Amino acid sequence: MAFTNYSSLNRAQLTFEYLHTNSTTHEFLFGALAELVDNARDADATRIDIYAERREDLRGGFMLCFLDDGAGMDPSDAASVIQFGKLAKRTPESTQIGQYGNGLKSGSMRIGKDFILFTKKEDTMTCLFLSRTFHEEEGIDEVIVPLPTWNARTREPVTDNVEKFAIETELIYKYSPFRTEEEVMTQFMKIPGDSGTLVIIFNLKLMDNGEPELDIISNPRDIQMAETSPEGTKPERRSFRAYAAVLYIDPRMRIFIHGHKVQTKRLSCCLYKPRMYKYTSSRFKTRAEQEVKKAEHVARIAEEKAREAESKARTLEVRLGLTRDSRVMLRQVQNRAITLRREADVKKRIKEAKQRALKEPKELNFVFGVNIEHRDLDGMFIYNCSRLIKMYEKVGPQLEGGMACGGVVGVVDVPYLVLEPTHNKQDFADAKEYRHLLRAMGEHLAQYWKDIAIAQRGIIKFWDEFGYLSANWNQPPSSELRYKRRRAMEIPTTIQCDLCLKWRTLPFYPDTWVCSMNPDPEQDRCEASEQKQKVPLGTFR
Amino acid sequence: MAFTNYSSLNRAQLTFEYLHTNSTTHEFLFGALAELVDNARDADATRIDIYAERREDLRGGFMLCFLDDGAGMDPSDAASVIQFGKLTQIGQYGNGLKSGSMRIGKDFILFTKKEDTMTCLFLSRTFHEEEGIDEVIVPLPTWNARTREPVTDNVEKFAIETELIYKYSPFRTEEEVMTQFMKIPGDSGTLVIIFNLKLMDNGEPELDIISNPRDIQMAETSPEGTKPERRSFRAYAAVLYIDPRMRIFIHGHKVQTKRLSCCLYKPRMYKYTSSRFKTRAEQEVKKAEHVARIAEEKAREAESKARTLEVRLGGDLTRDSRVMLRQVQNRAITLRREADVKKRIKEAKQRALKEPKELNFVFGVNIEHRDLDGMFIYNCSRLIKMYEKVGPQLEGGMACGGVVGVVDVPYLVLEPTHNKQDFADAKEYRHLLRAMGEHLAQYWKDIAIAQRGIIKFWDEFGYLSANWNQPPSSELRYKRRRAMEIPTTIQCDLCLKWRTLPFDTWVCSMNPDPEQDRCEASEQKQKVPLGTFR
Ligand SMILES: Nc1ncnc2c1ncn2[C@@H]1O[C@H](COP(=O)(O)OP(=O)(O)OP(=O)(O)O)[C@@H](O)[C@H]1O
Ligand SMILES: Nc1ncnc2c1ncn2[C@@H]1O[C@H](COP(=O)(O)OP(=O)(O)OP(=O)(O)O)[C@@H](O)[C@H]1O
Ligand SMILES: [Mg+2]
Ligand SMILES: [Mg+2]
Ligand SMILES: [Mg+2]
Ligand SMILES: [Zn+2]
Ligand SMILES: [Zn+2]
């Protein structure tokens, strides 16, 4: 639906140095790794393994590997990986984390110089190779990407251009970690199901002392930041095991680091006296109303177009009363009426669906609870379409010098209609609306504090009871048995089944666990339905 | 240096939606505007005008215009604007104009002039949306600056480009477009016009140009720890560069740009030896010396082959022998001049290595506005972080309250994030903040505000109120007590030099100091006294 032909006009293009520019969005390095985790989750993976493969010959001494059992990609899906940005016409997927068409490129190029991706779907498997080493060595200022595909059952090349295929694979054997077709096939065989994806980042960034930024040696079950950790340093900012555990508000996909299961968690299940407050969001309501007004305008224009075409069809029949050209013209009008009518009806259905959703409550659910195990790890955790964006954000009374609201963790999941993330997915694009949300969360936090009445009974004695002997607000509570049990009694023990993925409670560095290991006879089989945490409801003004 | 032919291989491409993705880097809206100001400064502009043009037919009701008298762009410079990624300039990422403009508005049109050309670059998301275009297609017509004839190798392309501009831009005819080019009055300069500005949910633009007609303010209520630089573009623009030269005007009214170190009580400078600075300079040298080493071995082999072939050919001198001898001899000549040029770069890096590898921390007391304190961190002169609390300021206390710190960090030590509002290397940035905090404690000991002591210090400058946030008294005796402590620095509107006065538009000849009394008098540098750490 364009006016002329634009084939001679200038196109904006990506140059090699833009790969670096894009990567500078990630000052928080774990946020780069999170992009690749998000992609596995969006592909409906039930499991992602993040692990190191030692390679003394590559910068940093290892390759960082992300292996998922998700849906994988066919060859055209794989070619769209290097499209920066997505397609505006794409069918809307409101619940996918991926919307910007950029995360894998920004994140991978923060972490290392090069990456190679292997993916399989149905009867194809495709390699995508992004080698900044190649571009530097050969003076390439474009961004050129080998993208060979093989048949997954026979291993024959699938290519319309055998010369292109030869050049692509030769680049891979020259510059990648894998020097032969056999070595490449070995990587494809690490995806053991019918589908999945393996992303390998290599030639990792080094600090000035020549050591990698990512330390996989100090704790061989973890990926840690290679930096000293001061007094108020949050575990999620130094330990990827800790960060990955809270990356999603509703974890289902299982996460393993170096082969060792991460205990993912629902933050609201780890806190003392969790309570939920429903916040009526005027922004949520106004934006839903605008999305409706737009759908109803789009259905309105399509209906007038269908109504005119049907009217013309009828009138043209009367006017024609019946020659050979006239016949053709009559069915071109009659069918055009038919197709506009079905177009108008489909847009009317979308309008109606948005109208139905408009009547649903336009609320954000703020959940608060007291972090009795780690009183200094407090503040708000703000998720956006289930993905963690801000952590440990102080609001309300926590912004004062005081013990008021000290220890309180808040959690909220914000839909895209209310806020969208910044380019690095570590902040919100609409700062004005985000600051509004934080003030609203602060007012509800104050109410939560009144509601649990810690101060009625008295705030210092509350903390004494859980074993905070020390006068320094940041030391952990006592580890002696009486205080451990006092704290543990308040926090249910939850665990995820490795087979069916349901979340279970037990009645008083995890290994394999399945439902039939539970001594509770009501949850002791994978077929037993999942029980929901019933977080009690509080009320505010 | 390409091995085989790569023309059939896939290229990464930019799609229309990427323009939006890229723009989401700017959560701080003024940091999007700063990208365009940075581009004028880098183009050696002596002036930028940022102003609104009312247009009730366009979204937000006005267009935001950036007009500079810098070096402008020839047609190939203009075309490289849409080559994403690029290259003591601020500009290094090849992105800022695109990320910033697309944060502010849906569309932009840029007009630029250099020598005998003038070029229009039109980025219309309206066009792409209306016509379902998923690539990023950019009209780029050029005219001759003197005759106004099109300069184009393809008149059909030129007709389509201009028709797009007349259809989708604010300017519907060639005459209207020429009127914009005529707003660039010198031989060179650039006019960037952002339009169809983003709206808030209430239908109003994010940028408020009404409340103060001499400013561009954020259209949001300001709580009262809210820093002026985060709601007033006039405030932000004044401190955007550590060494302002370019004059900045908003809606025709001059911004009083300033050097923060000149606005503070008892400024002192501490030299901080940076091991990061030294290690990175040493690595940049090791690299240059490897590059010159390889080139020299290549030149030495080629020269040796040239000499040996001369003695081997001896007296022969057939035509065939002569020509092939010169081929070898000239090849030696070229490699030798290549090797010599790399040896010169190596030497230059070696010389720079011996310069001190220091960051200069400057601290002073903000006696006019005690609550506007903390560190201002500049990166190659460009403000990155403001009001960052360090050292004793991170406690509850009056210790180091009111102290502003300033440091300019070279690219070798830190580079900025994608939005130029943070530092890409968080580990080294945190290290820098700790170092600044330690020096801040020393500065506090050094000015000995406890010899006075601290409450009596503040009450002498008129902080009568008990609340730390309220301004000091406005009564005349306290105004003069504060002003007496801050020397007066002022920029000449004609020659752009910075002057100190011994005491709107101002010029050098208005200075009563006989040594700085003429635009031709040499510029005097800040003499900040030096303190020492431990
Ligand atoms: N592990 C994976 N499994 C399946 N598909 C993947 C995987 N990783 C990437 N992709 C595909 O590659 C595309 C590009 O990924 P990328 O992260 O760059 O952008 P995105 O996920 O669409 O958006 P965002 O920028 O918001 O992350 C995805 O849209 C998806 O189609
Ligand atoms: N006002 C201007 N005057 C002259 N040249 C300009 C102007 N604005 C932009 N340019 C040119 O357009 C190019 C692209 O600008 P852009 O801001 O996108 O990237 P950059 O300044 O190279 O790097 P950065 O992304 O760090 O800002 C610049 O390199 C410069 O050559
Ligand atoms: Mg993604
Ligand atoms: Mg699968
Ligand atoms: Mg720029
Ligand atoms: Zn189960
Ligand atoms: Zn002068």
Residue numbers in the entry:
A (entry chain B): 1 to 321, 324 to 510, 519 to 551
B (entry chain A): 1 to 87, 95 to 510, 521 to 551
Wording from the paper:
Microrchidia CW-type zinc finger proteins (MORCs) are a family of transcriptional regulators conserved in eukaryotes. We recently showed that human MORC2 is necessary, in conjunction with the human silencing hub (HUSH), for silencing of transgenes integrated at chromatin loci with histone H3 trimethylated at lysine 9 H3K9me3. MORC2 is a 1032-amino acid protein predicted to contain several functional domains including an N-terminal GHKL-type ATPase module with a coiled-coil insertion (CC1).
The ATP molecules bound to S87L MORC2 were found in a nearly identical conformation to AMPPNP in the wild-type and T424R structures, confirming that AMPPNP is a reasonable mimic of the natural nucleotide substrate in this case. Ser87 is in the lid that covers bound ATP. Its sidechain hydroxyl forms a hydrogen bond with the β-phosphate of AMPPNP in the wild-type structure. In the S87L mutant, we found that the lid is partially missing in one protomer and has a completely different conformation in the other. In the latter protomer, the lid forms additional contacts across the dimer interface in the S87L mutant. Leu87 itself forms apolar contacts with Asp141 from the other protomer, but more importantly, Arg90 forms a tight salt bridge with Glu17 across protomers. These observations provide a plausible structural basis for the observation that S87L forms more stable ATP-bound dimers than wild-type, which in turn affects its cellular function.
